[PDB]
Amino acid sequence: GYVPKTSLSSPPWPEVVLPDPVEETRHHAEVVKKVNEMIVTGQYGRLFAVVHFASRQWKVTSEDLILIGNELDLACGERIRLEKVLLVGADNFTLLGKPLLGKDLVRVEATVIEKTESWPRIIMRFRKRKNFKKKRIVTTPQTVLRINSIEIAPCL
């Protein structure tokens, strides 16, 4: 099965060896414990979170403003918990959900600051030489949310 060392004898990409599962689990536990201790001792400043709200993912931090393109059935000034957090990150560590982080880990809270309409959007249809011309003006409801705080808990 041995092949002499030629240009095409081996794949160009470097060979990859799977680490032994015992050492992999040991290293995983060590890293998780280190990050959990950082969370316990509060060794982090600002937190950012990627949160799935409405239909989209928002990269979010405390004091941030977010413009949802629909009405939310919430009074202005009402506080809310954004429950679908995909990612939370600090300066020195990040936590990734698969695909979502647990409710125990992260708590992202927002506040309905504004309920508005968008500026008028023009929908015009035109087809040449067909007397085909149509115009419509649409205003989309919108809600401005302010992200008040992102909290993480040592539940790793």
Binding site: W58, E63, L65, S118
Partner: protein, 148 residues
């Protein structure tokens, strides 16, 4: 179109949600006519809904003039100084109710195109990317092809 229209960035008035929420609508002024079918809906709104709205929104001072100029109107004045005038001509009671609630909910900022659906004053926590992030350093800071 966007190119033939002013635009702004998403913003609040005084960081309206950080410490507490302050309703930005501060004044409503309904100019309503005693006679004239144009203000029939406004008259019914004053009879049936303006009191409930006023007690739901204690921070908004509501005036009812009962003698308008031109068409019956509602002038909404906001904390940031914005003045939005909405004609309530020939609108039904429910139409006026929804319009007034919309005025109460919205801020005084211009209803124009908003460039970004978000606004961060701290877009970066780990440090904004610059070309020298992810670039390894070299011994004694020697640039490529440097002799020493």
């Amino acid at each position: 179109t966007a190119r033939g229209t002013p635009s702004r960035f998403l913003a609040s008035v005084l960081h309206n949600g950080l410490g507490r929420y302050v309703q930005q609508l501060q004044r409503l002024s309904f100019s309503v006519s005693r006679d004239g079918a144009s203000s029939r809906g406004a008259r019914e709104f004053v009879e049936r809904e303006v009191i409930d709205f006023a007690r739901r929104n204690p921070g908004v001072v509501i005036y009812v003039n009962s003698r308008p100029c031109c068409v019956p109107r509602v002038v909404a004045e906001y904390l940031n100084g914005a003045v939005r005038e909405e004609s309530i001509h020939c609108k039904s009671v429910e139409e006026i109710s929804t319009l007034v609630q919309k005025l109460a909910d919205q801020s005084g900022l211009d209803v124009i195109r908003i460039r970004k659906p978000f606004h961060t004053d701290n877009p970066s926590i780990q440090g904004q990317w610059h070309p020298f992030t992810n670039k390894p350093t070299t011994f004694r800071g020697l640039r490529p092809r440097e002799v020493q």
